[PDB]
Amino acid sequence: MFLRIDRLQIELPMPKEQDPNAAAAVQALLGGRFGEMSTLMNYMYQSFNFRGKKALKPYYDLIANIATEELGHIELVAATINSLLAKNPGKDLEEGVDPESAPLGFAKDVRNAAHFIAGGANSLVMGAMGEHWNGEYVFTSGNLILDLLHNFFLEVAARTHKLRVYEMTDNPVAREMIGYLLVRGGVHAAAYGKALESLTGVEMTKMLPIPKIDNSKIPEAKKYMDLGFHRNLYRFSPEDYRDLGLIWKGASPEDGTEVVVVDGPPTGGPVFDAGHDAAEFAPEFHPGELYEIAKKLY
Amino acid sequence: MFLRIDRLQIELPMPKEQDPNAAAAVQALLGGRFGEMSTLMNYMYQSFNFRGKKALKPYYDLIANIATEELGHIELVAATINSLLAKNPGKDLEEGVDPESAPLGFAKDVRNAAHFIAGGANSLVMGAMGEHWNGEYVFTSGNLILDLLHNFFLEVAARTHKLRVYEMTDNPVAREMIGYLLVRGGVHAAAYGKALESLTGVEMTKMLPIPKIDNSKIPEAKKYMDLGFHRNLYRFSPEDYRDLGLIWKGASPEDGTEVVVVDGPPTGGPVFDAGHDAAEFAPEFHPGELYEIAKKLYE
Amino acid sequence: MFLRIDRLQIELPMPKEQDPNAAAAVQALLGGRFGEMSTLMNYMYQSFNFRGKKALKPYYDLIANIATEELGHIELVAATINSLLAKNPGKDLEEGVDPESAPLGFAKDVRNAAHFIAGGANSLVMGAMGEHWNGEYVFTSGNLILDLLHNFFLEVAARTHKLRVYEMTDNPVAREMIGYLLVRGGVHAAAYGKALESLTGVEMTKMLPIPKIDNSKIPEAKKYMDLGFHRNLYRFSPEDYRDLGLIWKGASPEDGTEVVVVDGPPTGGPVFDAGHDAAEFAPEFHPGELYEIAKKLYE
Amino acid sequence: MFLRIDRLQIELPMPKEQDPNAAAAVQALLGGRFGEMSTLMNYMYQSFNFRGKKALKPYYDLIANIATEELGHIELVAATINSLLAKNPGKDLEEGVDPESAPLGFAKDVRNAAHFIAGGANSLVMGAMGEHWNGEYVFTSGNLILDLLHNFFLEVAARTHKLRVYEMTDNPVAREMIGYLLVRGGVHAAAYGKALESLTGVEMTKMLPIPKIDNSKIPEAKKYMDLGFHRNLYRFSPEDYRDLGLIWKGASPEDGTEVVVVDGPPTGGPVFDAGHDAAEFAPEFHPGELYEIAKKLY
Amino acid sequence: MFLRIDRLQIELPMPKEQDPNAAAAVQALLGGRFGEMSTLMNYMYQSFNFRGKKALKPYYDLIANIATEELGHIELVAATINSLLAKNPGKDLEEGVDPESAPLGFAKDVRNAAHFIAGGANSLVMGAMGEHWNGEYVFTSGNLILDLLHNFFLEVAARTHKLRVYEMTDNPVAREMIGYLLVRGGVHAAAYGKALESLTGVEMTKMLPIPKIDNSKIPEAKKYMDLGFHRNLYRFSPEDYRDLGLIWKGASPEDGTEVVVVDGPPTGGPVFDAGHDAAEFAPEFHPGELYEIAKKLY
Amino acid sequence: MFLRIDRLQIELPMPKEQDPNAAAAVQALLGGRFGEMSTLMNYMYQSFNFRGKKALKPYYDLIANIATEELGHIELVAATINSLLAKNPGKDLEEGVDPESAPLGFAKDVRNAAHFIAGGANSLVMGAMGEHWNGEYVFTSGNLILDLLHNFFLEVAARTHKLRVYEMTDNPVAREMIGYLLVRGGVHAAAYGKALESLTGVEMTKMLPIPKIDNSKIPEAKKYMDLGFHRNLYRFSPEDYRDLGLIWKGASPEDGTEVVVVDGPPTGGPVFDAGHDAAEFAPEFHPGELYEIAKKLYE
Numbered sequence A, D, E: 001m002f003l004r005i006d007r008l009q010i011e012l013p014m015p016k017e018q019d020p021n022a023a024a025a026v027q028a029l030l031g032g033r034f035g036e037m038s039t040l041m042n043y044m045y046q047s048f049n050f051r052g053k054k055a056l057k058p059y060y061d062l063i064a065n066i067a068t069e070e071l072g073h074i075e076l077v078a079a080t081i082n083s084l085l086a087k088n089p090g091k092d093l094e095e096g097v098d099p100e101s102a103p104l105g106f107a108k109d110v111r112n113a114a115h116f117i118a119g120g121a122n123s124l125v126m127g128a129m130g131e132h133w134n135g136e137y138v139f140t141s142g143n144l145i146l147d148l149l150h151n152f153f154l155e156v157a158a159r160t161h162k163l164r165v166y167e168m169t170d171n172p173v174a175r176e177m178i179g180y181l182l183v184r185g186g187v188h189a190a191a192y193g194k195a196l197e198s199l200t201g202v203e204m205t206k207m208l209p210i211p212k213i214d215n216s217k218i219p220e221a222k223k224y225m226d227l228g229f230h231r232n233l234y235r236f237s238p239e240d241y242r243d244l245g246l247i248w249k250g251a252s253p254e255d256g257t258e259v260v261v262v263d264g265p266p267t268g269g270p271v272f273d274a275g276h277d278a279a280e281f282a283p284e285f286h287p288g289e290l291y292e293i294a295k296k297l298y
Numbered sequence B, C, F: 001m002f003l004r005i006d007r008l009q010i011e012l013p014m015p016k017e018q019d020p021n022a023a024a025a026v027q028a029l030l031g032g033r034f035g036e037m038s039t040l041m042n043y044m045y046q047s048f049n050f051r052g053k054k055a056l057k058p059y060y061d062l063i064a065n066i067a068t069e070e071l072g073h074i075e076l077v078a079a080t081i082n083s084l085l086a087k088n089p090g091k092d093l094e095e096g097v098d099p100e101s102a103p104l105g106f107a108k109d110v111r112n113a114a115h116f117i118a119g120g121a122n123s124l125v126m127g128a129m130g131e132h133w134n135g136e137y138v139f140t141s142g143n144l145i146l147d148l149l150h151n152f153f154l155e156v157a158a159r160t161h162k163l164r165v166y167e168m169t170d171n172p173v174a175r176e177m178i179g180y181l182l183v184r185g186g187v188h189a190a191a192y193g194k195a196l197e198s199l200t201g202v203e204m205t206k207m208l209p210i211p212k213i214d215n216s217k218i219p220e221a222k223k224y225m226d227l228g229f230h231r232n233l234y235r236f237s238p239e240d241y242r243d244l245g246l247i248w249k250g251a252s253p254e255d256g257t258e259v260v261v262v263d264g265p266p267t268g269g270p271v272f273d274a275g276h277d278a279a280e281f282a283p284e285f286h287p288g289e290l291y292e293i294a295k296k297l298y299e
Helices: A020-029 A036-049 A057-085 A144-166 A172-200 A219-226 A288-297 B020-029 B036-049 B057-085 B144-166 B172-200 B219-226 B288-297 C020-029 C036-049 C057-085 C144-166 C172-200 C219-226 C288-297 D020-029 D036-049 D057-085 D144-166 D172-200 D219-226 D288-297 E020-029 E036-049 E057-085 E144-166 E172-200 E219-226 E288-297 F020-029 F036-049 F057-085 F144-166 F172-200 F219-226 F288-297
Strands: A002-004 A232-235 A260-263 B002-004 B232-235 B260-263 C002-004 C232-235 C260-263 D002-004 D232-235 D260-263 E002-004 E232-235 E260-263 F002-004 F232-235 F260-263
Touching: A002 B057, A020 A057, A020 A144, A020 A172, A036 A057, A036 A144, A036 A172, A036 B057, A057 A144, A057 A172, A057 A232, A057 B002, A057 B036, A057 B288, A144 A172, A144 F144, A172 A219, A172 A232, A172 B288, A288 B057, A288 B172, B020 B057, B020 B144, B020 B172, B036 B057, B036 B144, B036 B172, B057 B144, B057 B172, B057 B232, B144 B172, B144 D144, B172 B219, B172 B232, C002 D057, C020 C057, C020 C144, C020 C172, C036 C057, C036 C144, C036 C172, C036 D057, C057 C144, C057 C172, C057 C232, C057 D002, C057 D036, C057 D288, C144 C172, C144 E144, C172 C219, C172 C232, C172 D288, C288 D057, C288 D172, D020 D057, D020 D144, D020 D172, D036 D057, D036 D144, D036 D172, D057 D144, D057 D172, D057 D232, D144 D172, D172 D219, D172 D232, E002 F057, E020 E057, E020 E144, E020 E172, E036 E057, E036 E144, E036 E172, E036 F057, E057 E144, E057 E172, E057 E232, E057 F002, E057 F036, E057 F288, E144 E172, E172 E219, E172 E232, E172 F288, E288 F057, E288 F172, F020 F057, F020 F144, F020 F172, F036 F057, F036 F144, F036 F172, F057 F144, F057 F172, F057 F232, F144 F172, F172 F219, F172 F232
Parallel strands: A232 A260, B232 B260, C232 C260, D232 D260, E232 E260, F232 F260
Antiparallel strands: A002 B002, C002 D002, E002 F002
């Protein structure tokens, strides 16, 4: 079972302008083959299908726990996309919008028109080409080492895509999210690397970084490393998966410092609210009436 | 953010033997268009994309919270499928399996061979025809009423599929899961129905049940309702979504009794471990050595 | 625009019992790449996209008209599949069905479980492997000769699939539909062949039949040819497409006899009603009440 | 069985210029998840699979009939797309086009290149992202009420997409089509709503409009409502489905006026002919010879 | 079994600038429904599934051989796409690239962002809309005549797409490739046409050209015809498929001249190397170290 | 460019009879995500997209060359599937087949009906669930180490699928192909492992085998290793890729013996001809006339 905390894993800067194509690119990091939806569903199903949940407990704890962090990862990337697509972030009401004026005219020429037709100027479960995320992006073989090897590759491939998208947009919201998830993804790659080292004797972490560029060279990532977040494997559980430290220990591939397990989730930041977008009829063409109904419920 | 509890939403019975085709059918309830992956992802993304999270908080609380319960739903259906595919449930080691003997011969003729090739005799993110779940099964328009209407339909369609699969498999593991999720799905349909009633004045809950057959006619579902589960909307959060009672109140479509918000998750049951299946090399052909490595980690 | 007549293109016999796998195979002839959905959508879109609707009218008439017949083709194949899936064809009500008895147990082991889960034991827009029909099965280039060449190939490929399915299912409902559509498909291939002959001078009809087996060897098809159906190109329109005879003339590839344009649609047969299937909750678990509501509508 | 009338459901204005991206957006209304292909195929298959065709005749008449109108809907949207992609609308011949000059250069940068590569600058069976329409967009459960509930939702979702596309392009051809289909779609939503009301007692039509904006506020839609088209449910059949009036009666959700069944199809307008586009080799690079062959057939 | 020669089927001009959208369009000729991947896989599988490999040897030789040439066709189109996406063609190292500067900013607005996210600014197995090539684009019925008819259509449809893409970009690399493959594709269409003529008596080659425009009117294609390449059916095999001449003989649909079988593959040209693209971390962020490792291996 | 030799990479035994479901399972090894189509296309495109073809030649040689061997791999698996689907292997003509007798009746109930409808009882570009192979199964990042890591994983995952299918089908044709490709796949994994060791210092080959079961335990694979095939990296080129030995050297993960580069392709075995299947109209309903036409071509 799962519980939810109404907070993003980190505080994101408020968007200052809509950037459709930046959002379209960031989608690759959400619903693309190596987006957070894939890291999420791969570990989630592997955790469900895990054989030897007690006999190989440290490894089960690891996959089950990281799968839980991934839920926060898709949430964070979705909030980033929504920030890039929000017309009036944080504003509950905008009046005077008239469909006849073609208020969505700009969307006719952007890469991703779905964001404005299927979505109400919001995130969708797809990649940078509009391809919807699909279950075949998941690998759950039941063989522990094979799955771990897949996961190590999965994380470094995912990192590569984040670095490339980072180079496509200088948008502060997108780069803040990328900087943080580069660090978190790096922790996961290191964790699976350590898991493989313990089971096979092969020094997988010595292969890092892939590509051969350090996260320390990415300002937004360095910011979080300076706070020590590359050393933390958060235990996203009230009382379970307490044996993470048996694998998550030793040197960090980033700077060689000792890594540690942090019981409980990160502090986090507030959730994001794109506000009212009348042209998208979201949450309603004119939500005044609905806001009154909600008020009366109290 | 989210937290995880290593417990299934309910305790599942143990299967007498493997039933591949039963597992193949149950997949429709996991990765199919109206499977739990769809209810999960629809509410999850709608919650992310929700506009007016504070101004329309009662409704946001509802979608955000139910989305969290859906995580337990996919987990439960996956556990059911894994139970149906497990050769030695609860057994850590089986020795003597020889690939030359064609130990997976039976799998050559079952409906879903992927369960035994791509999966190590375990669940996959797909439906009853092998179709992988996809993001287009998600509807997130940004318009509250439109999304709620979609969700009401989504749950009754999902219920219909569970009823049909219930009639295909007599397996107690499958029927226990279905009985429970019929009740939970009913709570969600009722919740979205009440939300629509408050926003539009249209008495959506009076349309229930759909199809026109009561959950009380399904033995397993009836038991869970006798335990009062049709009245419960669990607040799956440490401190958030505390306004669920503003919408989740009034009569239950099942028996007209007063519904209630339950603080926190239910106790549930233990997670499932399919055990060792050497032919599937899961968790390893012979996990003896890996088990020793694990033991040594504890020093 | 279009109009509808509540009649199948031909009368279909009634099945002795359900045959799920026969229905699964026949789906290839509906939603598969070369199923009737493909001939329908290819000609339908080509007709919409046709350039020179007046300057090349004889050819536009042909594609626009055949596209209309294709609507009857998907309807007929769907009716065949529904017949094979019907538990109580022609019966409005069956009482006593209890989900607890696992009334759909047999469906757990058939090839296509979707027919019983997503569908209420009815046709779906897919092929023989559960693959849903998709728009990329359509070719609409805007170039007349290229489209016509594609269409000629499309029909003979479609014929090949029908012949193969004919050899898989001995069911009279399936074979009656196939015998008829082999003849109709043959008329279309002949028509596109004649169109190509007029535009390029290449004697495409002399390549027929493909495969090299005559429709006369298929009993059901032979009967329809004995009724003269291989000579008929029906003008499925009240007043339009009156120039079909400019291309649809001359010898039939089947027997060398003069082909003819028939004014209007054939009489056909009655539509099919699968009846009540309580286990599938179709049209309702127990439709008694709904039937009363319907009766009351007439006052 | 079916018959065809060589007319669009309504007369469309002639396009004055090519607008590729407008056409790309309008595709969402044709081959997208909630495009006319979906309303068409959903009702068409439901009508085929209908159980109790006589015992529940009024409802069968309704679905079977509306499915027939939908055929005209995909035809109308396709004509709209073709109008937006036509270089020389209504002109049988253009000479002097030389491929070496790169006459399709502009298409290299438009959103939908398929329109010009796979299609001969014509409509395709896909959505706004190039996604081809697929059979999983169809819901045919065999359960009457469940199907009707799905259809009610389907129509209001489809309306929402039309409103959004309407706001993306001020193109007269696209807006004329959208205005008319907003009205027709509204009739269908109202019809399914009334069907549900008769079978369940739940006042579904009271939920309209969704989104909360009236079609009367859309000039092109208001135009057709002023002609009374929101009150008409046309019986697209020579002699069948004569019991539509048992469900289609009472007040219109638009203005509360009495709705009625109109026997026979609407008058309609002429079909559209995009003319010759040599660069697309449609209908031929130079159709002069083919035109002569056709002439001789007469 | 197969062997490989490290040469492109023809020498290609070096790209003078990156042209993302041109590359996106050319993808239709690679992974699109009628791209070289389709001609390749259709003939390849038909050759595997061929019944009567000896009893119908001339026809088997034909399909098995052309399938082999198609391998060079996907290679040539891929090299063309890579040429259009190469930042520093032929250069092993570029220094000073800093991700923080958003060096891939331009890619945020191009049609195909996948080229820069999933690919390292390189070709992908997809079409012009980002659709990945799929096995359903293959037709292998086992019936010889049906397959040959399909192949004749396949080649003329493929030609049509090449002509359309040719008209979308005046890029020299793309047009050189298109000119050559128009000629090679024409040979294949003629070959299948002749095969059909021998088996059915129907003069299929008389239907050419389709569309009704001659390759001689395309400068780049005429260039290769003047060298006589439209007359050559190369036998891509050391010692097998020696009976091609039984079908490949007689007049060429292009100019009526006698066609001939050429034993062995064409001379070809050098392979293409897109060089170092640091922003894409290809072959590495900074390959200096890897180049040294390779050097030491020698 | 490429050249073709009309020989399979190994000689395959002849099947005793058709085994449709065995063929359906083997399809996973051809068109499935980890089938030979994936190893082929991954290396093929990586070789096209390779940057630093001269500066990193040893690695380019490796990928370009193995990609060429993969062509023989898809050919071999296709031949295995065709063998399992052949009614009259090696027989040019069967007379008397009558479609009316429902000669393909058995196919109505097999897992993969597409083999008999879309295919003329022959291989298709798909997996074990009918899913068609697609380009997204290809990973070509342009980054050498990332691609090599992917390839190492790709081969061991592919091996795992072959081992599972080996346990599903006891058919000698399937097991001979699997035994051989387990060995060849092992060589490729070893090769990519050695490439990674040279570029990163990480001893990837020490992770082998995955799963933890030796190929020596599979009879058919053991035989090929006894013939020394696990040591061979064939240079599938007339004059190119002559630097394979710079990486393909040292100990074999199988037995620690010195691996070697073999100049040119192996002798292999004859290609497979499924013969005439009249019910499938392949190569023709009755090929008598076509055979005469072919004979006459030789004058």
